[PDB]
């Protein structure tokens, strides 16, 4: 058989949410993708031997309330919370996004993965260990990625699927 997973990608604009999503759905690096486009994208993959259909909401324009975004997040099964490792502000914003998720999911056990993107870049400002501390305080995995080189992309999305699987077993 197959299983579907409803995923949401959140984080400051410019962190690489669209680039990460497109690496998953199309397997290459799209460096210019309209920063205002928010949409969902479907991709069939295989994870741990199981056929999986992922439906991924790539968020954008979070400065304005969107009812469609809110309804998708309310029913979303798991969340990637993305920052860029060369942008300290995007890391400090993670708290805002996790609050926003737990605010709309009525739960403190929501499948989530913290993602530090742009790890191909040399001028890092957020140490891996600082991000590991934050993920531990939330009880969630931390995965480093580069949408440019594809490093860690499958790891981030597949780890989220694995977290959802465990949650659904409860």
Ligand X SMILES: Nc1nc2c(ncn2[C@@H]2O[C@H](COP(=O)(O)OP(=O)(O)O)[C@@H](O)[C@H]2O)c(=O)[nH]1
The residues that touch ligand X, with contacts defined as CB under 6 A, are 13-19, 31, 33, 35, 117-118, 120-121, 146-148
Contact between 112 and 98 under an 8 Å Cβ cutoff? The reply is yes
User: Are 93 and 127 in contact, with CB atoms under 8 Å apart?
Assistant: no
State both tokens at 13: 């604009």
Comparison of 18 and 159: residue with beta carbon closer to ligand X: 18
Q: Which is nearer to ligand X, 141 or 152 (by Cβ)?
A: 152
Residue 22 Cβ vs Mg ion, minimum distance, rounded to whole Å: 9
Partner whose footprint covers residue 117, from Mg ion, ligand X, none (CB < 5 to 8 Å by kind): ligand X
Q: Whose Cβ is closer to ligand X: residue 20's or residue 165's?
A: 20
| Contact present, 43 and 24 (Cβ < 8 Å) | yes
**Residues constituting the chain:** 170
Place of tokens 């949409």: 39
Question: In whole angstroms, how close is the CB of 49 to ligand X at the nearest point?
Answer: 28
Contact with Mg ion (CB under 5 A): which of 9, 12, 15, 18?
18
DSSP 3-state of 107: coil
Residue 3 pairs in a beta bridge with: 52
* Binding residues for Mg ion (CB under 5 A): 17-18, 60
């Amino acid at each position: 058989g197959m299983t579907e997973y409803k995923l949401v990608v959140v984080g400051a604009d410019g962190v690489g949410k669209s680039a990460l999503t497109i690496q998953l759905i199309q397997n290459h690096f799209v460096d210019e993708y309209d920063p205002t486009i928010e949409d969902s994208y479907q991709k069939q993959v295989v994870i741990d031997g199981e056929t999986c259909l992922l439906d991924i909401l790539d968020t954008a324009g979070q400065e304005e309330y969107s009812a469609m975004r809110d309804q998708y997040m309310r029913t979303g099964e798991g969340f990637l919370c993305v920052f860029a490792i060369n942008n300290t502000k995007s890391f400090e914003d993670i708290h805002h996004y996790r609050e926003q998720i737990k605010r709309v999911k009525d739960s403190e056990d929501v499948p989530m993965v913290l993602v530090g993107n742009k790890c191909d870049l040399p001028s890092r400002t957020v140490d891996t260990k600082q991000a590991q501390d934050l993920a531990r305080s939330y009880g969630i995995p931390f995965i480093e990625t580069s949408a440019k080189t594809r490093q860690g992309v499958d790891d981030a999305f597949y780890t989220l699927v694995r977290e959802i699987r465990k949650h659904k077993e409860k």
